[PDB]
Every structure is written in C-alpha cells, then in structure tokens.
Amino acid sequence: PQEVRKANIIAARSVADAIRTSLGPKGMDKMIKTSRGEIIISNDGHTILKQMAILHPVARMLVEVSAAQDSEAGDGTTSVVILTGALLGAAERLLNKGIHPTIIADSFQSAAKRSVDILLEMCHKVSLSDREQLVRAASTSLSSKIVSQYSSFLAPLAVDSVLKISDENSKNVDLNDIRLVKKVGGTIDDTEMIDGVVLTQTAIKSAGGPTRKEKAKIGLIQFQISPPKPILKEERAYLLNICKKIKKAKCNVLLIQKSILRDAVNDLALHFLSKLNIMVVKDIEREEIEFLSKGLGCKPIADIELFTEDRLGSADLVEEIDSDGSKIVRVTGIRNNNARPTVSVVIRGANNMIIDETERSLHDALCVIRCLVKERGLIAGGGAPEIEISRRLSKEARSMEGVQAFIWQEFASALEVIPTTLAENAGLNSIKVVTELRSKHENGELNTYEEHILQPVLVSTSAITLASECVKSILRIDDIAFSR
Amino acid sequence: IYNGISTSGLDLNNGTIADMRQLGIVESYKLKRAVVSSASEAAEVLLRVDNIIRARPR
Amino acid sequence: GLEAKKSHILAARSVASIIKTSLGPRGLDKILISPDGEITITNDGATILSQMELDNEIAKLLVQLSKSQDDEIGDGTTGVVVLASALLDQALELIQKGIHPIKIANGFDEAAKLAISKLEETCDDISASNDELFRDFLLRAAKTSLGSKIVSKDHDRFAEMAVEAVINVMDKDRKDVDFDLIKMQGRVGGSISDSKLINGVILDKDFSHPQMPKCVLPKEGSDGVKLAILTCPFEPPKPKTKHKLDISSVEEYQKLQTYEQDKFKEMIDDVKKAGADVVICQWGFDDEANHLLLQNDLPAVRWVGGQELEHIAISTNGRIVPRFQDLSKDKLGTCSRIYEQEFGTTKDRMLIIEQSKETKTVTCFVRGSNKMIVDEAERALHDSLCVVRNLVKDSRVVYGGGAAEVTMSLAVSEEADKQRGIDQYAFRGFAQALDTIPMTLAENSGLDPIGTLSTLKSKQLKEKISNIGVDCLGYGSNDMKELFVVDPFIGKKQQILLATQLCRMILKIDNVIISGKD
Amino acid sequence: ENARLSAFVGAIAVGDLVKSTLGPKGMDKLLQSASSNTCMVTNDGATILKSIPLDNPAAKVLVNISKVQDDEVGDGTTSVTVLSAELLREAEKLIDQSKIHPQTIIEGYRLASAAAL
Amino acid sequence: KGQIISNINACVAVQEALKPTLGPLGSDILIVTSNQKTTISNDGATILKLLDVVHPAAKTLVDISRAQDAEVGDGTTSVTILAGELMKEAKPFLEEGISSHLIMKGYRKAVSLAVEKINELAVDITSEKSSGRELLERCARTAMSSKLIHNNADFFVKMCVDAVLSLDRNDLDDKLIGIKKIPGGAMEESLFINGVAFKKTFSYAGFEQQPKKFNNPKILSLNVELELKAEKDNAEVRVEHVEDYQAIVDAEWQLIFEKLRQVEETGANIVLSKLPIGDLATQFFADRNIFCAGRVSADDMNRVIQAVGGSIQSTTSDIKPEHLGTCALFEEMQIGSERYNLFQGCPQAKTCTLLLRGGAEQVIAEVERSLHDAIMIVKRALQNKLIVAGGGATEMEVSKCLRDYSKTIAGKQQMIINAFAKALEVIPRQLCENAGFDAIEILNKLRLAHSKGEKWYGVVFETENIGDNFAKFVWEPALVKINALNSATEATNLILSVDETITNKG
C-alpha cells in the first residue's frame, strides 16, 4: 500500500513547499496561467490552490482546509499548508522504520489537544470589556493595506459591532450577517453603522416615487409587477388589484427579487403607488434573499395569496441618503427582540480599487476580533508560539514510552519550519535567526510587543488542529480506484 | 484459551491480553450468526465453481 | 559544492549498511569467496572490509582505518563504521539547512569531549571492588565472542590461556602488548581440547634422523639448554669463478677424501666450548651431515622460516652466533628443556619447548577438527588479548552493549540547551546519532528499536541512574550489572575518537578526481 | 484454468477494498470518477462495491450476498466479504498440495459451523 | 573567440580544485593517481603536479606554481587562484568588444603601482617591543590556533623554536628537519631530538641486547652486504663419496671471514646501510657494544653523512679511520610496541629530528602538516626582516588604492584596473568560506573600518569579527606578496594572448 501513500505524500510535499515560499508579504508569489488566458498574481494560498486545478485527489483536501481556515480563524491559510507539509515530510522516515500509520495518526490528534493547553498557559489573559486592546488589534492589522490614517477611524467601528453581537456564551457568530455594500463615490471618512439593515442597490429614480417613507413594513416578496403575459384600462385594472391587496396589510416597502425573465415595476403602477407613498426597491440579488430573511425576521413570499401581515417586518424610518454616485437607503429601528441586529456598513470611495480592497481588509479585521469571542487571549507571532511549544516538548518526550516517544521528537522538529520560513523570506539567515530566538528563551518568553505586531490565539490553535486531521485523513486512504 | 481462561480477549488500547468482562467490550451475538450463515452460503456456491459464465448486461 | 555532498552520504551509507546486520553476537554471518576458490564465513567485520576491492573513493577510508583498529582495539571494526554512518546521516539534513560542513566537523569534536567527562563520574572500579573479580572478567572475556560457536562448550579451557599469556608479554609500566610478540599458529586436524598454553616458541621439528633422542640431556648439571641458530648458507666450497668439480676415477677416492674432512675438525671444537645443544639453520641439511653430531648428542634443525626465528631468540633468550672463535657462554640462552610431545592422532609429531621463567613473548597454540574452526578461533583470541590490555591500562570501566550509547545520548542532549549558538543543533544531531547503535542492536536482536530505546531512557531517569543495555542474545533478564558483564572504557573511548576522526575526513573532501584505465 | 484464479484470487481483490475498512480504526478508500470533482471519502463497504464497475464476471456473486445481509441487519455487511475472502484465499492450498473435492470441503464447514455456533 | 572562452572554463576548473585548499582551516582534496596511491594534501604545488592536465592553459597554471615553489616555496595555492580569477573578470569584457590586449596592459600598470605600496606597508622591526626568545614563539602559535593541538600547543612551541635555533640562521630549509610518526601514546609527551632518527622497520630477532645507554659509539657507513648469505645466485656441487658428504656441507663459512675480520679491527660501534642486514651478526656486536640496525631507508642515510661527517665505502679494505664519528649520548624508546633509534648530542649535525606522538596515525598526519605552516613563519622571520600584515590586511588595501588611482586614469584602463581590484576579493572570500564564516557579512563589515585610514585591519580567524591582525600575531613576508602579483600576471598574460589552440597527435 505504500506506493499509493508515498506517491501522494511526495506530490503533496511539492505543493506545500511551493506555497511555503509565499508565506509573508515578502514571500515569493506564484503565477497561474489559465487555459483561457487569464493570469492572476497574489500571495493568497486559498486563491492559488483554487485556480491551480489540481488533479491530485489528496492534494485537493488543502482547499477545504484553507476554506475552513479563513472561515473560522480568518488567518494562516498559507501557514496551515506549511504545517501540513511539514508533518508529511517527517513521515517519510516513519514508514521506513516499520511504524504503522495508526500510531502516527493517533499521536497527531493527542499532540494537538496538549498543544492548546501549553499555549493557554503562556498566553496573557484579556477580557472583551477593555477597549484598549480591541482598538489596537484592528488598527495594527490594517498596516498591510493602502489605508493608513483612515485605519484609526474604522478601528472603533469594528470593535463596537462585534461586542454587541458577541454576548458571552454565543461563541461562534455567523459571518453571513455582516454584509459590506461598496459603491463608487464618497470617501472613507463618511461611515454609518445602520444596525437595522442595508440593501445592495438604490431606489426608483423615476418620477412620482417618494423614495422616503416613515413607519413602514418591510417584507420579502417574489412577485413582480408586469402587464398580462400569458387595452390601457385593461392593464391598469389588472394592476389595481395587485396594489389593493398590498394596501390590506399596509406594506409600504416592496422588495422584488432581481430576475432577467420579466421586468420589475411597470410605469403605470408608479402613479398608483405614488398616492399611497409606497416605496419600492428593485434589483434585489439572490444572495440577499437569505440575508434579509434573518435580521428582519421575515419570510419569502412566492405568490400574492401567500402575502400576509404577520410576515411583514417593521421599519421606523426609511429614507434615501443624498450622496454623490451613492444614493444609499438606510433603515433604523427594526424592533426585533428575538433576532439580533445585523451589522452592515456602507463602504464609499472615489476609486474602484479603494472600496474593493477595503472590503477585504475589514473581513480580516472582524475575524481577528471574533477570535477573542470564542477564546480570549492573544499570542504574538513571528515564530514565538511555534518555538515555545518545542521547548516544552523536549523534556516531555523523554516521559513517553514505545513508538509514540519518537513521534514527539519529530513533532517539535516540524513546528520549526514556520519560523524558519519567516526568516528566509526576510532575507536573514534561516538557522542564525532561529538560534538567537532560542538563546534568549531562557530569560524572555513572548518577546515584537514594541513593534505593535499581534496575532490571535485561534489562528495558531486552528492551524494545528486542522493540519492534524488533514494528515490523519491522508494516511487513511491506501488505494485509489476508478469509480463511475 | 487453549488451557482454561476462555473469557480472555485482545485489548486494542493497551495492546495486550486483558479480561473482556472487566473492560466491557462486547459484540452482538445475532451479528455473529448472521456473518457465519452468510459466509457459509456464499462460499458454498463459489467453491463449487469449475467455470465462469459471464452474465448478460441489462 | 552541489552533488558532491549528497553523493558522499549515499555512497558511505550503502557500504556501511552491509555490516549493520552483523553487529553483535546475534548478528548474522556472511559467505565470502576468495579469488582462489575458498569459501570463508565469519562474523568479524575486519575480514569483510579487507576483502572489498572497489574504486569508490569514499569507501576507501573504511579499509585504511580498519587496519589500525585491529592492533589498537580490534572490536572497533563494525561498531565504528555503523557509528560513523550515523554522523553522516545527521549531517545530510544540516547541509540542506545551510550549515557549514566544517562547523559540523568541529561540532562533533566538542560534543565528544564533553561526553567523555560525563562517563568519568558514572564509571566503576574493578581493582577497588576486589582482586579476583578482575580475573573473572578475563575468563568471561572470550566467552562472549565464542558463545555463538561450538567452541562455547570447551570455553572454560581457553579462558585460562589468555590470563598468563598477557602478564608475561606486558609490563605494568607501559601496559602495552606488541603484536609481533604474539605468535599465532594453527593447523588442520585434531580437536580443540588438546590446546595447551606454551610459554615459548613451538618450532615443530622431526629431529631429523630418528636415532636422535626426543629429550635434551642436562649435560652434567649444565645451566639450562643452549641453542645455536645460523642464518649463514652452510654449504660446499663454491668459489666465485671456477667450480667444475668432478671425480675422474677410483684413483681420486683417497686423494680428495682426507683433504676435506680435516677442515670442520677445527670448528667443531669451538662449538663444544660454548655448549650449544642444537643447531638451527634456515635451509635443509644433508643425510650424512647429522651423523657425526649424533655421537656427541647434538641434534640439528633444518627448514625454518625467517619469521619463526624471532620467537626463538626472544623466548629462549638465545642469539645467532656470528663467529665461533669469540663466542662465549655469557649471552647464550638457557631454557627448561626441549622435548617431543605427540598431538592427537596427527603423524606430524610436534614438540613442546618450555621455559619456566617469565619471557617477553608467547606463542598461541590453537587446534581444531576443521580449517574454519581454527581460523575462527585465532581471530577471536586476538580480540580477547586486547581487552585484557585495556582492563590493565584503565581500571575504570563502563557497561556497554547499548547502555553506554544511551547514557552518552542523554548527557549531550541535556547540555545542548545550556550551550547556545550554532553548536546547539550540533549537539542535538550528535545525540541523535548516538541512538543509532542501541537501535541497531535492537534491530539486530529482533525487537522494536524505538520501543526498546524509549525503555532504556525511562529507566535511567525516573528510577535512578544506571547502565542497562540491549540484549542481542537471550539472557535471564535486564541489568547486565547483575551478570557482571563489563566492557573496557578506554576501548569504547578509542572507538568514539576514531569515529569523529573518520567523519571529518569524509566531510573535508568536497572533490573526487580519478583518472582512467588503459 | 483461469476460472479458479478469477473465482479465488480475483475475488480477493474485491474483498481487499473492504478488508482494511473493518473496525472503527480501519482505513478508508477513495472512489474517483472521470471528472474527479464528484469523489468522496467513506468507510462504507456496500457503497464502494456497488459504485465501482466490476468487469470480473465472478465478482457479481458477492454483490447479491451483501444485499441479503443488509435485509437482516444493517451492521456487519463489511465483515461478510472479509470472512468470505479468507476462505477463498486458503482455497489455493486446497488444490495444489491437497487435491480434495470441493463439496467435501463445504461439508466440512457444516460440521465446523455446527460446533462453532 | 570560441577557443578563448573555452580557455576561461579551463582555468576555473583548475581554480575550483584549489579554492577549498586555501587557508590553514581549508578543506583537503582527494586525488587518485594512476599508481593507485592515495594522496591527500592542501598544498597547491603537489596538487597541480599530480593532475598532469593536457590542456595548454591549465598546464601553464601548473608550471607557474613550480616557479612559485622554487624561488619562494610559499603561496603556491594563492598564486593560481589569483591568476585564474582574471579569466572570469575578463570574460564579459570580450563579449562587449573590449580586446584582451588592453586588459593585459592594464595589469602591468596596476601591479607596478601595487608593488610600491607593499614596501610602504612593510615595517622592519626586530628588537622593538620584542625579545629574542619570545619573537619566534609568538609566530608558531598563529598556525597552531583553531586546531586540535591548541590545548597542547604550549609544549609544542618549545620544540618548534629549538628546531630552528639548532641550525645556522644563514641557511635554513624545511627538508632538513626530519619528522617521524610514533603510533600511540600521549601528545604532550613528545620530545625533541638533536640528531637523526629513522623508523626502525627491522622486525627480526636479536632483541633484549644493545641497551639504550651508549658512551661514544663509532658510526661507519656501509655499502655492500656484510652477511655471507647469497640471495640470488647459486651453484651445483655434488660428490659420489660417502664420507665426503659431511665435509661438503662444512665449507662456505670461511669465505667472508677474511673480510669480516677487518671490521673488528676498525671498532665501529654503529652499523647502518641501505640494505637489510642479516641476522647472523646480531650477537657478537653486543659483546663489543656495537649497534646494528637493518632495513633502513635510503633517504635517512644521507643525513648520517651530514651529521658525524662519515663516508660511504664499497668494501671494508680501503675504509679510512677518520671517516668514523661519534655522538654525545644515545637513546632508544620502546613506546608504541616498536623500538626507535635516535642520536643525540652531535655538534657537527646539519639536521635534526622531531618526534610526534598521538592517538592515531591519521591524527598525527594532521598535526605534522599543521606544524609545517608554522615552520615557514619561523624560518622566514630570521631570513627576511621585512614583513607585511596578512590575513586580509594587505589584500584589501591593494584593491582600495587602485580604486582611487583609476579615477585619474582615462580610457578603458579605468574599468580594467577596477576589475583587477575586484578580482582581489576572491582571496579573503575563500578564507572565510573555508573557515566556516559567512563571506557576505564580513565583506560588508570589513569595508567599514577599512575606509577609516588604517591599512592594517585584518580578519580574525578564531572568532568571527573585524579587527586588526597585529594583536592576532599574523605575520607574512614581503617576498611572497610581491612575487604573487608578478607570477599571476605573467601566467595570465600568456593565456589571454593565445586565441587559437592547436594540438597535434603523435
């Protein structure tokens, strides 16, 4: 069976060593030229592995690990691939000694659980009630982005949004409730929380539309205003009963799902809704159908008979903010006690490249803050947590017995690959920098604190946990057969 | 088990011979008879085969 | 600078991997075929490495080093080569990390010197424990190497032969044993129970004409037995030019007769004044040449090699007389007696020359019913004589057989954290390289190398500091200290020094240059 | 001559897929298609055997055996093929150095199964 | 231009072999001769002599190394590395259109200005801040540093200084000091011998006599064989008489007794020859206190003539009485399970012998060659009083001055001299790489203090750092640095001046 496993380990090691050169901002970028002629350039490991079109079945598992790495911790997509390949490289000599992979697989899961308690003892205990470390966490994380002076203004915006939805025992919080709507125009200095909800499009620009209404109900409606499609008074008669049934439930906000099949609202219906001051917002994306059904607590309504008053939400004031090239509609005071208020922030800027990278930069800032919700505390990066674990495993490896005693020795050696790569990508000598870190380890422990470089504990914790089960599942498949 | 000690078994955790009554690892008796009866009927047809006639594809 | 460092590691590993399975008493043998058509089977790595003829420049260092190891120790044949391959495997991983090769070579020297001082505290004393416990180590020294052979039944007889042989040839001042002072001789036929310990040279001789007695007379209470060796070509009157001697007829019978024999009558008087009992020469003798010396009870010896004359003069304190005129009785050697003792059913009818006094040389006498048994017993006795020299030169010893390598591993690995810098990783790789020997002995014993190594490390830390090795041959239990199994410390110390010296010479050569064959 | 090899040695390769998947600590197998994006990883023995097309005409006999076992109880389907594979593996020595009628070997199993139960 | 490029790679291939052998800590190269004899040495002379390269330009680098070893004897490795480095610097200049003739012309002006700077850096100092005995002792510890003998180097310097002072300071040679390896024993127990000693390969009998204590033994050379034994020829003599069979074995002992009697009348107590001495004579010499040793090498017999003033005579007839000689005291040591013969107290001896002891034969071989590098420093100290600071000191300043002088020079010679100055950086490079130090970091750090105006800043060979070699006691003679630039330039000018290589088979 080793011919199947050794061929997969060597194939996966070459992929991990290739992504290893991309670690850090100074790392070596990888280029992928698609068959259609598109060429992408970036250091993101999740983007490289997705567009590489890997034909190796076991090597495709790194895409699922990198996807869960950004969804849970939010950082370390490149580091988790390096740690996965580090265990595979050390496993080559394990098979030569006659070691069965069960002991190899079971030792990785047992070492991952013990490595968490080691990091927690060396980590500093912090609380979410103190806003001093919360603002500095998101401010220093934006030093890798074009924004510099505006990074301090968006720092308290991300802190106050998470602390309200974090509570205490909620633990993991769904990130789908956070939607950043980007639009050309405006600037970064103009920000509005708008905890009620934020849509992705503008309102009706035609004549007669009020565009503003107070004390209205918001609900999801999949219907569409169109003439009969299997004379002027005949089409107006068919549209009269449509607007009359909506008036029965006093629904002043009509959200129509965007579809290329038919139109949205007929021009004849605009004059009918203008008398009742019923605001209509069209071009609702399919992704926003599930988003609006959560924070607003409404239900999608397919037909006109399914439309009821009990499925309609509540909106205190609905108005269209006047701005250059923006025209964003805001809703405040949804008055939903059961569902938590959603967080949607509008991103504005003159250049299209601004609102793009800004949206991606805020996603990584919310994940790092969310790491403190599940497990409080942080550990400074730069190879500190990787070396600290190997220091404790030196004396602990002698306390074991049997085949597992040798695994603890190789497990600490594979952890040194991460700080070694960080020293190589910076131009410094690999071994020389690592020896200087272990020399001062007798006095200093976590000391990078003066450089304002901080990392959450969940990234270092999830990187070991995901890489432990990854390599564990690799050795489980001893054969590959064609099944169709 | 050859001489006495008929309740002994193999322990997967400790990798040695231990008492199965103390560890509490048991398997259903109905499962034992179902596998033996299925293997006896399956091997009865296969051992009698002196030639193979390929079935017609449906 | 590129493929040289990678090729030297794989080339030296494939050659060293041959004898890794033969290490220890359980190590399997090999079938070696000489170019003359003789098949030899032995467990000694010195024979296997010496028979290797190869053009690989890396493996040539193993043959040149093994020649000096047999005289100094003799047990560092297989052990050092396996240990040297461990230092090269750990150095290969450092090359890919950017470690300089000389730093790897200098790192092993500083790590070896620190490990020697650690065993100096944990070593035990022999003579301080008791006097007779030292002799018990000499009796069981050859039992370990011969335990895998049929000789292990009679081993009690061969144990007392090495005790008295080393004391005579070695003085407590320098405590050194010379290889030229030990005569190793054996023949085919007989058994191993007839082997006797002789204090002097054998010098097998048939006593020429059978009328000569088998014993040497004391010659009226004379002191000892005096011998005379002559390397001169004692021979007819061959001139430098003419020669051409022929008998014309019977008329020349009495003319040339009395003209010849009257010569030797002058030189025979000088021999009787010195009292030399026997005459020894390098070449043969005539038939009538020994008849006149028979009436005077003066036997003669012929057909003696040049190397055999070394052990005759040293043991019997004799010399080779340049001239009979000025020869005196002062420097003539005196021994106990010279007699003929038949050995088994062999018709050669060998003899025994005793001394009864302490000499500067000894002669090993080994017999066997097979040609292979004789050769295997001669080489095993050579290593047994060197262990006795190491026990006298160094009283402090340690327990080997896997216990010494584990102790040296935990000592270097513990001090690795206290020493910072580049040498921090040089000590870790050196400690992991020392673990190869106990794992090799565990693999050669048919046991889990990792599962056994973890056991030896746990017993020396949580319980107490002691020496517990891996058993290649089935024994009662662990803790060889109870079985009184000891190994020389200076013998093991010489192995780790030659291992680091061999590892440096391999890394210090980055280029391979060789011409062609025409 | 090749019918005995396909019914014995050829049937072992079918049981080798479910051999290492027995037990909670057992190994896993991979089912790969032409597009390779539809694949999955599971330890189920009944799914692997039915998904993989079998060109061996003698391998279809063990397919109906697993279907009968699944009706009784949904557990132990993997152990049926594994136990049947060991009886066919030892059948090679029952021919060369034995030369024993196969029905007499089957009748010996009925006497052994009576004492086993 | 195709053959010129081919000659560039031929010089780099030869240079690459000598790069690891540069420096005392440098690596050693293994070369297998057609004789199937293993030879390992770091000296570039012997390395290039065993290659026998058919390439004409590669042979030029070998021939120029013999001239460096003849007139000087030191720097044979660095002269080839410096000469071959100009081939790599001139490689890109050929593709750009610059002819090699103007490149060779710029070297003559650069070396002419470099030799003038060498005499300015050479300061003659003898008795200033130095004594007579401590002058040569501090020079021996330079080559012994960073070695396995550093702990025992205290006792080794005393034996090294006494070897040079035992000979006339006007004529000194490294081949006059003999060294014999003694297997086994402690390294700190080695002693110095004033006379000559050999290996004593004689394994035969006749031991326990000829004690190590002599008064005034007489030394006499030997040519023919004193023993009566005839190894090669023979004859056939047979008689038909019964009683004559006894007398026909009894004869030949009288033949050489005539010539052997004249040896006793001479009274020579020492018998040495280039041929093995028979075992027949090993007894009576003990009665007369005469010593004899056989199987002596021919090279060790030449030192006996220069010691007591002996002479080699064919026969024992015409030997003259004044050819004999005697020493003050004799000593024989059995250490190492082998007897060793050595003479002591010879006032007329023109040679000496230094014995070395160690744990293994391969360990002593590294100690013997590490001493040869220290002997050349001690020998050239008294011979030449003009010394220059080495270890990177002089090598870096020669490249610095050429950078400033090239600014005033116009034309192609500016970049050519700058290329020659850049080619001087290969010498300190290989010294750092062979010693383990990083050549990239030292190259940047050494140029820092090098611009402060002090020209004596060297490179520390023990601990990685920048500083002055004056405290490291690293001294080099001025004749080596001057002849190295001339030999490397002359050898380079011959290779670049040949565009076409023609080889005819015969």
Print the SS3 string covering E308-334: HCCCCCCCCCCCCHHHCECCCEEEEEC
Cβ contact B–D (≥3 pairs, < 8 Å): yes
A248 & A314 share domain:
yes
A148 & A235 share domain:
no
- DSSP letters of E189-257? G--EESS-B------SS--S-S-S--SSPPEEEE-S--S---SS---------STHHHHTTS-GGGTTH
For residues E167 and E125, give the distance between their C-alpha atoms in angstroms, rounded to a whole number.
Answer: 23
For residues C486 and A224, give the distance between their C-alpha atoms in angstroms, rounded to a whole number.
Answer: 98
- Which residues lie across from A216 on neighbouring strands? A315
Residue C498, class by beta-carbon neighbours within 10 Å (0-12 exposed, 13-18 middle, 19+ buried)? buried
Among partner residues C424, C450, C453, which is closest to A435 by beta-carbon distance? C424
Residue from A211, E232, E246, D35 nearest C293 by CA:
E246
For residues A183 and A325, give the distance between their C-alpha atoms in angstroms, rounded to a whole number.
Answer: 8
Are C282 and C306 spatial neighbours (Cβ–Cβ below 8 Å)? yes
Give the active site residue among C42, C44, C144, C361.
C44
Those residues with Cβ within 8 angstroms of residue A289's Cβ, 6 or more apart along the chain or in another chain: A220, A257, A300
Residue C371 tokens read as 């040609």
- Chain C residues with CB-CB distance to A435 below 8 A: 420-422, 424-425
Residue from C75, E10, C450 nearest A100 by CA:
C450
CB contact (8 A) between residue E280 and residue C360: no
Instruction: Provide the residue count of chain B.
Output: 58
Minimal CA separation from A472 to chain C, in Å? 21
A211 & A232 share domain:
yes
Local structure of C182: helix, strand or coil: strand
Interface chains of chain B (3 or more CB pairs under 8 Å): D
Residue C141 tokens read as 């020294």
For residues E200 and E411, give the distance between their C-alpha atoms in angstroms, rounded to a whole number.
Answer: 68
> Which residue among A293, A318, A340 closes a domain?
A340
Q: Say whether A140 is catalytic.
A: no
Give the active site residue among A160, A190, A263, A364.
A364
**A2 interfacial to chain D (CB closer than 8 Å):** no
A237 & A105 share domain:
no
Q: What are phi and psi of C53, to 5 degrees?
A: -115, 110
CB contact (8 A) between residue D117 and residue B40: no
For residue D57, give the DSSP letter: G
Q: Residue C12: how many CA atoms within 13 Å on its side-chain side?
A: 29
DSSP E strand stretches across C221-299: 227-230, 278-281
Cβ contact E–D (≥3 pairs, < 8 Å): no
- Chain B residues with CB-CB distance to D76 below 8 A: 31, 34-35
CA distances from C275 to B30, C112, C354 (A): 106, 60, 19
CB contact (8 A) between residue C320 and residue E253: no
Q: How far from the centroid of its chain's Cα atoms is residue E324's Cα? A: 32
E179 & E243 share domain:
no
Are C146 and C140 spatial neighbours (Cβ–Cβ below 8 Å)? no
CATH code, domain with E230: 3.50.7.10
User: What is the domain range of residue A150?
Assistant: 127-195+341-376
CATH code, domain with A63: 1.10.560.10
Those residues with Cβ within 8 angstroms of residue A199's Cβ, 6 or more apart along the chain or in another chain: A181, A281, A284, A288, A329
E285 & E212 share domain:
yes
E268 & E218 share domain:
yes
Residue from A192, A240, A197 nearest A219 by CA:
A197
Block residue for tokens 């040539």: C60
E243 & E227 share domain:
yes
CA distances from C331 to A408, C275, C306, E209 (A): 74, 12, 21, 9
CA distances from D66 to B32, B38, B52, D70, D89 (A): 15, 9, 20, 6, 19
List residues of chain B with CB under 8 Å from any CB of chain D: 12, 28, 30-31, 33-36, 38-55
**A232 interfacial to chain D (CB closer than 8 Å):** no
CA distances from C316 to C157, C255, C299, D57 (A): 26, 44, 17, 92
**D33 interfacial to chain A (CB closer than 8 Å):** yes
A206 & A330 share domain:
yes
**C257 interfacial to chain A (CB closer than 8 Å):** no
Four-point Cα dihedral C47, C50, C55, C59, nearest 10:
80
Are C400 and C492 spatial neighbours (Cβ–Cβ below 8 Å)? yes
Strand pairing of C351-354 and C337-340? antiparallel
CB contact (8 A) between residue A97 and residue C99: no
Structural element, H or E, at residue A40 = strand A39-42
Please name the amino acid found at residue E110.
Answer: A
Are A27 and A440 spatial neighbours (Cβ–Cβ below 8 Å)? no
Query: What's the domain count of chain A?
Result: 3
- Chain D residues with CB-CB distance to A484 below 8 A: 33-34, 53
CB contact (8 A) between residue C458 and residue A406: no
Block residue for tokens 């974090």: A166
> How many CB atoms lie under 10 A from the CB of residue E269?
22
Resolution (A): 4.6
Interface chains of chain D (3 or more CB pairs under 8 Å): A, B
**A102 interfacial to chain D (CB closer than 8 Å):** yes
Are A328 and A196 spatial neighbours (Cβ–Cβ below 8 Å)? no
A211 & A333 share domain:
yes
Q: Say whether C383 is catalytic.
A: yes
E213 & E153 share domain:
no
Structural element, H or E, at residue E458 = strand E457-459
For residue B12, give the DSSP letter: T
Structural element, H or E, at residue D4 = helix D2-19
A226 & A325 share domain:
yes
Interface chains of chain C (3 or more CB pairs under 8 Å): A, E
Among partner residues E246, E280, E283, which is closest to C288 by beta-carbon distance? E246
Q: Say whether A78 is catalytic.
A: yes
* Largest interatomic CA distance in chain A: 92
E212 & E355 share domain:
yes
> Which residue among A340, A366, A392 closes a domain?
A340
E206 & E300 share domain:
yes
Q: Say whether C44 is catalytic.
A: yes
Which sign does the torsion angle of CA A384, A386, A389, A390 carry? negative
Q: Which of residues 89-148 of A touch C (CB under 8 A)?
A: 97, 99
A383 & A434 share domain:
yes
E246 & E319 share domain:
yes
E203 & E170 share domain:
no
Give the active site residue among C42, C70, C78, C471.
C78
A372 & A382 share domain:
no
Give the active site residue among C42, C70, C75, C77.
C77
Interface chains of chain A (3 or more CB pairs under 8 Å): C, D
For residues C346 and C341, give the distance between their C-alpha atoms in angstroms, rounded to a whole number.
Answer: 11
User: What is the domain range of residue E317?
Assistant: 197-382
Rg (CA), chain A: 28
E241 & E307 share domain:
yes
Are A156 and A135 spatial neighbours (Cβ–Cβ below 8 Å)? yes
A276 & A383 share domain:
no
For residue C349, give the DSSP letter: -
Q: Name the closest residue on chain B to residue D67, using Cα atoms.
A: B38
